[model samples]
Target: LPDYVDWRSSGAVVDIKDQGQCGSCWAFSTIAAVEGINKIATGDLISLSEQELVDCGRTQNTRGCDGGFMTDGFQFIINNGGINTEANYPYTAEEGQCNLDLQQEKYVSIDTYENVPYNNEWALQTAVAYQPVSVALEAAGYNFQHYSSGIFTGPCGTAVDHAVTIVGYGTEGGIDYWIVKNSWGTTWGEEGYMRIQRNVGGVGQCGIAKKASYPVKYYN
Candidate 1:
């Protein structure tokens, strides 16, 4: 891996978008990451559609909304000819049918960064520097509750269900913090954004374990 990796510094603040009633956290995270990256590269954060990936990227046991690896989803985009903006792709949440026209979406030459490994710190830093990067957290047996500031120690044992993006990171009075943009609407997590313990393995821990984007790629 390279000594250091940098993510695009431009993107948009997207909704966390609960895959509610479904298990497609993987698809949501994948779409969010790609959407942010693609928008930064193209200078157009047009809310790329997750529905496209959900319907088209399904293979083997990786079903839509069923939770999977964002890295795998990234590779899927590269291997399957890239993804499209929501304007071109559009999100429907439902499994639905696949549209070939979505293939017309723009894509940059990402062959160069294919070998880059996912770095958790880089991922968090990427989100802090650029737009938010979606990730899956271990959300098991929590009764689907939402809170702004609190330690989530569910029995999930590192399992993450909900998908969210890291927007920024900072420290307050010696407490490390991470600015997270959530999709549970504005009612939860500090106006739709949460500041969690950074060093204590909050989002960073989850991101690092899952090998979040480290050597993120972006087109000029």
Candidate 2:
């Protein structure tokens, strides 16, 4: 693992975003993974559409704003042919009616999606080595709600309530962590990012290893 991995510098990551007061974190997580694989495959850092998923995410057990699954969001793209660009759809951080008019053409698409096996952080680490993996975690608490910086050993729970992108993983001060990108805006957490401690055993430091998944984009 080279003792470190920064997909952000490797051009597999895009900028962070905020989920606002909405429960649309699943969209952000899905978009980040999709954007990451697309950037890595195409050699261009293009921002895809979260709002497209927000409005059009009606398949694979994914709801609009209440909550969603990463697999469902990826399935939405496959059913819709592709996902629209951020410049085309944009994000509103809230529920909106599905509008196909002026939907235009989608800029990015994924070949297929798969889960990183349940409750296995080692598999997650390996999956993330290929691309940004989508992970759902327990993120509602003072430890996660008002995080500042550093490798955060959360005083949080194991019940999944939020989703984020596992962009990179590394060690700091003998602490191994999965570097995560959040959607609660740059003002929240560590400038909209956080590092959750890894290998502490059991569900991966707040259920991050439970619902992890990733997308596969064949080289074009």
Candidate 3:
């Protein structure tokens, strides 16, 4: 086994799926990372539902599907008895009324990791080793299929509006690919994922770019 790691690359993207006028970006990214990590941890690629977290995790100020942070979101899951699989807690994407029906769903145990810092090589390595690291992306001139060079430079002319997962990293075709997973439903880029240039520090520039590892301390 791979030492029961936490972080892994995913197939999500930075495309800001409008929470249908709701502020749930944080929840979306949080669950997206969890879904990817959970699959890696269990070897079962199940698309766990984020709606449960979104609708139920509101008391933590997570605003159903709008936007928030990963750390707080993770903590919410731990506090609220964890989350459920997509089958039990299906996703509608659009922000709807909250339904606090825990009995209607099946939740897994709450899991936690050491919060990684940003812009650190150790953080990057830690993210790849543990769970998929959630990073802020520069969504400027980014076409789903069209590849471009030198994308990190300004006229970063767009607001930082989306988040994505970094699953794995490698060098290919003389270019380093970050092996990113997107949330645009496989129909977007490279089957719901993409490979941005690494080393040059283009897309990898974000607050989640920490050099720390996960399960920081084991209780068992």
Candidate 4:
């Protein structure tokens, strides 16, 4: 009832996005980072390319939702010159046949990205302060499958199976928490959001503090 930080209410977010069971969690995470930085850079609220990331976020390190690292996806953005708009490359939940031009006008572009050091919640918080941060963690067990709302104090353990975006942070009833956005659709987890426990030791709930990062772009 006291300390709180809702990025949505503060004019930083627009919706709770949905990934729709595509195992493309990493695409959504990268898309959110680009969205956040693009908003700060241009004062626009349109969406970036998740479908591009899902189909093309592949590399030596990433396998197009077999799993992906946000950094690898970040490199994809830079090497490809930029990403297309959602309308240009509509999400199909499964990789679609290529017919659209990847060289069309970009919706957004990033200067670069960084890994915020494992177990450094302070660094993670700092990144999210400027924009939503792409993060990965060891989320397993029934604890994750049923996270509806409230601060998640879980039975989750370390295995690093998924990627997501950290939008902000706050404290509730003296327990610190990280505000998370998921790609699992609005039907899941507080309208596609989750308040994960934070500052509860090194790894924190779901090991969210372990691997975190954000994008860097010119904020005009």
**Residue-pair clashes per candidate:** 8, 3, 33, 2
lDDT of 1 by residue, 1-220 (tens): 2222223233454555655566666666666666665556666655666677777777775777665555566666777666676667766657767777766565432331222233345445644465445555544434225555544323244445566655566666666555655555567656665665555544344442244441155555
Q: Which has the greatest lDDT?
A: 2
Model 4 lDDT, full chain set: 0.77
lDDT per model vs. reference: 0.55, 0.85, 0.53, 0.77
Candidate 1: pairs in clash: 23-65, 23-66, 24-65, 24-66, 48-86, 137-160, 138-159, 138-160
Q: Kindly list the per-residue Cα lDDT of model 3 for residues 135-203, writing each as its tens digit.
A: 556543545324333222223322345556666666655665565555555455565556665555422
Global lDDT for candidate 3?
A: 0.53
Q: Which residue runs does candidate 2 get wrong by more than 4 Å?
A: 102-104
Off by over 4 Å in 1: 1-11, 107-132, 141-144, 149-156, 201-209
TM-score of each: 0.72, 0.95, 0.70, 0.92
Sort order, lDDT high to low: 2, 4, 1, 3
Q: How much does candidate 2 score in TM-score?
A: 0.95
- Give candidate 2's error at residue 71 in angstroms: 0.7
Q: Candidate 3 regions off by >4 Å?
A: 1-23, 40-43, 59-61, 140-160, 201-220
Angstrom error of the Cα, residue 6, model 3: value is 13
TM-score (C-alpha) between model 3 and the true structure: 0.70
